[PDB]
């Protein structure tokens, strides 16, 4: 029956009817997304950025680890010598979460306490926006990187169990797949470069 | 492997090993312990 699709269609109907009601009544500027962004506290955006950064990086690492690990244990019943050879496929999936640690260490130094006046100023709102989107960028890039490197690691374990002269040539694809998380790290450290703390 | 020399001796000796495995399997179903001579000295040790 696709009950979740029914929930999606109900949400869309309610949104369209509500916005059309506000237009035809004459109050279309009451749905004010810009005033929501000035009255919401910047500590919310900063802490959601930090928490979703480390959570999404760890989720991508764990996903890639079970994708490569299931096939590596299955391909080791007949060839048990692939185990210590293919351990660096798991090492590439697990440095995804250390990048999330590094980002959460850098960004948590900027969580200082602001004053009651001089709270919703330009610099504090900027710091909230920057930390939120920087945390999302490095966490989502690390989720994607971890899943891709896990798939390539499972395929490399199968290929190493087949012929041992193949693991040197499938390891090149895991090197290409791991630069994506480091680019996510660089853009995360660069989006929050000019952001001050919460003075 | 079937064209190397000294392959008939291997066939005779592992026929004997097959029969000894049959003897050990027949020592199940009638619980009779193996002797297990623990003198591991008259073969391996000093003097080599």
């Amino acid at each position: 029956f696709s009950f979740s699709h029914f929930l999606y269609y109900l949400v869309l109907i309610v949104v369209i009817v509500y916005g059309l009601y506000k237009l035809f009544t004459g109050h279309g500027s009451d749905i004010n997304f810009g005033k929501f962004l000035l009255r919401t506290s910047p500590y919310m955006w900063a802490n959601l950025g930090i928490a979703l950064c480390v959570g999404l990086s760890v989720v991508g690492a764990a996903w890639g680890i079970f994708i490569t690990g299931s096939s590596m244990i299955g391909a080791g019943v007949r060839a048990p010598r692939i185990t210590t050879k293919n351990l660096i496929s798991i090492i590439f999936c697990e440095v995804v979460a250390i990048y999330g640690l590094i980002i959460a260490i850098v960004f948590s130094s900027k969580l200082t306490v602001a004053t009651a006046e001089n709270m919703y100023s330009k610099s504090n709102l900027y710091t909230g926006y920057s930390l939120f989107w920087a945390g999302i960028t490095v966490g989502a890039s690390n989720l994607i990187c971890g899943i891709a490197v896990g798939i390539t690691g499972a395929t490399a374990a199968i290929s190493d169990a087949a012929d041992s002269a193949l693991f040197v040539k499938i390891l090149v694809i895991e090197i290409f797949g791991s630069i994506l998380g480091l680019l996510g790290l660089i853009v995360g450290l660069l989006m929050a470069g000019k952001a001050s703390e919460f003075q | 492997a079937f064209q190397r020399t000294f392959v008939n001796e291997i066939r005779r000796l592992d026929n004997v090993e097959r029969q000894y495995r049959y003897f050990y399997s027949l020592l199940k179903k009638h619980d009779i312990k193996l002797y297990e001579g623990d003198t591991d000295k008259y073969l391996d040790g000093s003097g080599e």
Partner: protein, 345 residues
Amino acid sequence: MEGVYFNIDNGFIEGVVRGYRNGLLSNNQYINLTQCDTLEDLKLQLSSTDYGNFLSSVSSESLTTSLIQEYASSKLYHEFNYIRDQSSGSTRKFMDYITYGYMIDNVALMITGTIHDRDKGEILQRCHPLGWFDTLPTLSVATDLESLYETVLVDTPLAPYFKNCFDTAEELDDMNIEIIRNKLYKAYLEDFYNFVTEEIPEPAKECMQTLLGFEADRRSINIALNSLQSSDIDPDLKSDLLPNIGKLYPLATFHLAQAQDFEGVRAALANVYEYRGFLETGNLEDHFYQLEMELCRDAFTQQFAISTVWAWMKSKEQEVRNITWIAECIAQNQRERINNYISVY
């Protein structure tokens, strides 16, 4: 993509069956088996492969051509039962659907052997241990079909396939049992194609669709070439024996249902591109075995797919056919056609 959700419950299965694939005999190992003089030399030369020490505890002089394929098949069937015990959800249904096609052959064999008054114990052997279903030896009673289906076949998983089979109400001879077998196999291939289409994910979906299409096409060609012989069948009574899937269905099964002689079959396959190189040859089944092995080799390139479980299972069964063909030539000194094995790996 496909590798994201595949390894949650099928990664161990995938790795184990790829490792099973790696023990398939390549072309040099069959040459080394061909050069053997006696059958003990074949035993030593197979001991250096992934069969190794399976004809241990036999003898040096109780070694027979029948015993070699009995043990080499029992190894395969224990491996299939090991993979099926580690499966769950959709893979377990896939492997049960593999089993049903052997259950049908056991049913036809038991019903045929009951008519010719022979022993129940000798039909219970040579009766393919993979499609077993515990109530099978109860088929040796009550020689018409209506006392078979109403007592023992309704509880089997073959029960939905007896829909198109109740047009007779008498006892059975060798023609009627083959008609029942062809109708059961038609309903089976259509139901298993429909299971593959609605429930298996995509890189395995298309592979199993082309493999089951090949199986249906071979069934169609053999039913068309076994019906022009000394019989008389109405052409609309023969279109109920041809399966509704494959790449020769919507046009060429209309023409194979009406072919009156051998030139009506060559004319029907002349339009399909993958065929019509088959009816001028030596053997006719050695084209089907060769094309099936080229299909099964192509199924091992898809990495996150359970079609591999099919592609292993048909490849290893080819391998047990090859070794027997070598063992029938070494034990009988018939080295003239010994190199006619079929090897792709």
